[PDB]
Structures are given as C-alpha cells and as structure tokens.
RNA sequence: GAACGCCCCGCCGGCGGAUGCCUCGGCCCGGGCGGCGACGAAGAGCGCGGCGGAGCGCGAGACGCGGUGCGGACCCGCCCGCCCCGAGAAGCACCGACCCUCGAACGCAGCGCGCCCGGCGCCGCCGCCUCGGCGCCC
C-alpha cells in the first residue's frame, strides 16, 4: 500500500430516469421575434 | 368740538361652521361554516386599458381567453361595436386553461455566475443497483 489514507471506494453512479415527465407540455416564454421587439422611437434626432 | 372707543334705536354686509334634519357606515346578540401549502401557500415586487394617475382586478394568453347553461338591449367621456325568431350589448352561476421575479423557496448567488448538454437542493420510509470491514464463519 502506497498512500496511508483511507478514501471512499469507487462505486457505480446512475443517471436519472423519472417514471413520468415533470413537464409533459412544452410551453412558450417571453422571447420570440415579434414579441422581443416592441416599437421604434421616432424623433428628428433619430 | 370733532374723531377714536362703548351701547344698541333699528336696517343691511363679512368671518366662522354650531344647531336641526338626513345616512350604501359602525357596534351588540344569535345562527351557519369550518373550506390553505413543494400540484409552490400567506405575503411582497414589477408589469398589463385606444386615449390611463390612485384603488379593485388580472399575469407576456395580462383592465382578460375558452366551454356549458341562463339573460335579452345596451356599452358612465370621446370613439368603437352590437341591432334581425337568434344573428346577441349589460349581467349571473359553475367548469377548463394561462399564471413574470422574490418568498417554506429548491444548481450557487441576488441581479451576477457555474457544472452538464435531459438536467443539476435538504431530510425521512420502502425497494433496488454498486460496494467496504485484521465483525462472526467458511
Ligand atoms: Mg405564454
Ligand atoms: Mg392603475
Ligand atoms: Mg429560485
């Protein structure tokens, strides 16, 4: 034995696998073109 | 003397908000009811109307959207719109959805950043996968 310390053994780790979906329907958000842009600002400076 | 001041013989004006009458409000008693939340509550922030400050309401589907019933001429301003044996304004009741940030508040922080390309908090119960021990044995 080379190291004098005891560390936790390496053990298998699993990936997730939910039995039902937590978001069954994919809904929209704030961002989409024509909603992210509101209007232009019209001045003589502009 | 006049005038100022004071009293009222009377006629008018101010300033102030008492009195009287009125009341979509309080207070007391009795009867019901006893119905929140990780399926994200109570509370807080911000935003939403054609002209839109406050409060009510609503959530980027925002001063509301749909479905079943009922109702049957209006919609406080300016406009729009509806109008008829159904074509459908006000209003009402139940039901289905949408539901931004913070909050028990859940990737870390509170407004800035990550690991990973589905996602990514803590405790507990029951199972399951993979494992440690010079514990008791073989
Ligand atoms: Mg949306
Ligand atoms: Mg307002
Ligand atoms: Mg959070």
């Amino acid at each position: 034995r080379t190291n004098v310390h005891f560390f936790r053994p390496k053990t298998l780790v699993h990936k997730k696998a939910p039995l039902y979906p937590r978001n069954p329907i994919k809904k929209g958000s704030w961002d989409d073109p024509c909603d992210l842009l509101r209007y232009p600002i019209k001045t003589d400076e502009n």
Side-chain angles (χ1 to χ4, degrees):
Chain A
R1 163 188 274 271
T2 51
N3 200 304
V4 82
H5 298 108
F6 186 88
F7 310 96
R8 201 181 58 74
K10 299 303 164 177
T11 279
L12 186 63
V13 305
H14 310 93
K15 299 312 184 68
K16 303 185 87 68
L19 275 176
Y20 55 88
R22 271 63 160 158
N23 310 278
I25 282 140
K26 305 320 187 304
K27 297 172 187 161
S29 169
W30 64 272
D31 64 83
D32 57 81
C34 298
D35 254 312
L36 178 163
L37 322 158
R38 305 310 289 165
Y39 50 83
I41 292 319
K42 188 236 170 68
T43 69
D44 306 308
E45 168 206 61
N46 285 10

